[PDB]
Design a protein around this ligand. Structure first.
Ligand SMILES: [Cl-]
Ligand code: NA
Ligand SMILES: [Zn+2]
Lengths: 100, 9, 276
């Protein structure tokens, strides 16, 4: 049973502008086994209306998934993705930064 | 279109 | 250009209760067009692209029958492999399989592939000749001997060189409006001060299709890899892809740096330079 830690990128579908509706993405890749917990957070609280892509994989057999939700960037709200997997000692929180 | 060969390991 | 049709299958055993979770996805190039998820309500192969919705009831009945036959093969394989590797019934294990065909610019067969992994490692794969098998270990060597006696590579070669490419060409025609259209990357550069004397320049490539792209930084016309960061190509979520490459530079020296973008949708590569 091979164990590979997820790579995580948190980003918006479109270049972000405060007050303009958009999509918050959490792309998790390079991981094995497929069991993974992914939540999108708004001010530390889990967003309930979250969808995900169908599990697929790369050349080296590592898995990838996209978790996404509609959101509206603002000056005050903080967004993030929280990931837990057997390879992590603690859940990893990656904050959304509109410049990345 | 999927393959119809379903051979087991 | 060149095109491909590929199917990906994953089955994950559930030692606590029930049968394996099974997920199958079909792609033409970088476009997902069908899916099956054993946890979904339909229990049918489902369309994921408008051009496949054109196919009649016999197509959907046939793809549903075949994908459920693939699910049963993986379930049997999970049990077989537990025994080959002398593993307990207590742990969860995974089987993955990918197969498909590539066609050249002329839409003629270029190559076929059929490979299988157990617990994220190569198990058995068809060689490029479509006649021989690559077995990664002694458990897979047992499978290779069994398949060498049951005409398996012959049946797979006939599918990969015939059915696979014939149906790929049918999909390429039916879905012409999207499948044969290239979406060149929308590119721009952003600038982020990192101190009062250094800044990050970030070169963005957005909304492009297919996913294959090259972003490279140059300084004074020569490749620069020191102090650069390249992210993995990522899905936008609308069927297109995104990527960025960044470099940390001394403030006031931004004009020496150029970002070079290569993509199939561009007649000539793009060059971007920070303009203050
Ligand atoms: Cl705001
Ligand atoms: Na054979
Ligand atoms: Zn300094």
């Amino acid at each position: 049973m091979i164990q590979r830690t997820p790579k995580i990128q948190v980003y918006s579908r479109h270049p972000a502008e405060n007050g303009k509706s958009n999509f918050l993405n959490c792309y998790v890749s390079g991981f094995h086994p497929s069991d993974i917990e992914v939540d999108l957070l708004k001010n530390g609280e889990r967003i309930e209306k979250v969808e995900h892509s169908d599990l697929s994989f790369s050349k080296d057999w590592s898995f990838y998934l996209l978790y996404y939700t509609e959101f509206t960037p603002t000056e005050k709200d903080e967004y993030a993705c929280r990931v837990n997997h057997v390879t992590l000692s603690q859940p990893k929180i990656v904050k959304w930064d509109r410049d990345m | 279109r999927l393959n119809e060969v379903a051979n087991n390991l | 250009g060149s095109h491909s049709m590929r199917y990906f299958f994953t089955s994950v055993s559930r030692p606590g209760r029930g049968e394996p979770r099974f997920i199958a996805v079909g792609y033409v190039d970088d476009t997902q067009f069908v899916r099956f998820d054993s946890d979904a309500a339909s229990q049918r192969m489902e369309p994921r692209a408008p051009w496949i919705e054109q196919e009649g009831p016999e197509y959907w009945d046939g793809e549903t029958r075949k994908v459920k036959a693939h699910s049963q093969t993986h379930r049997v394989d999970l049990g077989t492999l537990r025994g080959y590797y002398n593993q307990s019934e207590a742990g969860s294990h995974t089987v993955q399989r990918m197969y498909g065909c590539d066609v050249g610019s002329d839409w003629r067969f270029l190559r076929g592939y059929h490979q299988y992994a157990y617990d994220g490692k190569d198990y058995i794969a068809l060689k490029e000749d479509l006649r021989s098998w690559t077995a990664a270990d002694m458990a897979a060597q047992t499978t290779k001997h069994k398949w060498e006696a049951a005409h398996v590579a012959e049946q797979l070669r006939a599918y990969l060189e015939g059915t696979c490419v014939e149906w790929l060409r049918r999909y390429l025609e039916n879905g012409k409006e999207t499948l044969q259209r290239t979406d060149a990357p929308k590119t721009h550069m952003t600038h982020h001060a990192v101190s009062d004397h250094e800044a990050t320049l970030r070169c963005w490539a957005l909304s492009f299709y297919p996913a294959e792209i090259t972003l490279t930084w140059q300084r004074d016309g020569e490749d620069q890899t020191q102090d650069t960061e390249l992210v993995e190509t990522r899905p936008a979520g609308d069927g297109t892809f995104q990527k960025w490459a960044a470099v940390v530079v001394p403030s006031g020296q931004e004009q020496r740096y150029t970002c070079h973008v290569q993509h199939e949708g561009l007649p000539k590569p793009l060059t971007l330079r920070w303009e203050p």
